[PDB]
Design a protein around this ligand. Structure first.
Ligand SMILES: C[C@H]1CC[C@@H](O)[C@H]1NC(=O)[C@H](Cc1ccccc1)C[C@H](O)CN1CCN(C(=O)CCc2cccnc2)C[C@H]1C(=O)NC(C)(C)C
Lengths: 99, 99
């Protein structure tokens, strides 16, 4: 797909059999999802955004289908404004910027 | 050009004679730059993100040169850790997300 940026790039993702809206964020290194229950253990992470740092929990090897494209990688759960898809998953689905 | 997301999408921009390094961010609605002097009148704005809100100065109708391409728009100047080129100017250079 080709997505223009006139509007906010919100796509539908499927995680844990659920559907959610997520932001295709190229300026985000990591994928950060809203507070939810993921399986397995979690390690601690401190990520910094525009207003400083927050603490998140990292889950490894989570299957997440972004627009009919499967991806298995690291997902961070924490107090984020919206669900964010970062470069770690954007590269898995073959996402690039063109101009 | 086609920019892959293995690395951070950084590019050189020219604003007011100064050449700066900026990150192409599809997750950002606005364009925010590190503290600097821009001519004209400004308006205090409060923008939020991961970590919270920061107070920025809003300058309208500012010209920026993103990889040779010129773009005219509103740029916020404040205490940001990275120079962000948001959707408002991304659309101007015909920036698109493909996968
Ligand atoms: C994702 C993190 C993981 C690790 C870092 O990679 C990190 N990246 C980022 O945070 C980068 C900046 C950065 C990159 C590299 C080094 C340091 C900092 C910004 C992010 O891509 C854009 N971001 C998405 C979430 N946002 C929203 O949903 C807004 C919703 C909303 C609701 C109500 C009121 N206001 C806003 C805020 C928005 C943002 O920042 N927008 C502005 C205008 C402020 C720039």
């Amino acid at each position: 797909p080709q997505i223009t940026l006139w509007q906010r790039p919100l796509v539908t993702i499927k995680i844990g059999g659920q559907l959610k809206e997520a932001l295709l964020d190229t300026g985000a290194d990591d994928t950060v999802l809203e507070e939810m229950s993921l399986p397995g253990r979690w390690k601690p992470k401190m990520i910094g955004g525009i207003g400083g740092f927050i603490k998140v929990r990292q889950y490894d090897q989570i299957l997440i289908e972004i627009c009919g494209h499967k991806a298995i990688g690291t997902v961070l759960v924490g107090p984020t404004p919206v669900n964010i898809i970062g470069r770690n998953l954007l590269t898995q689905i073959g996402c690039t910027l063109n101009f």
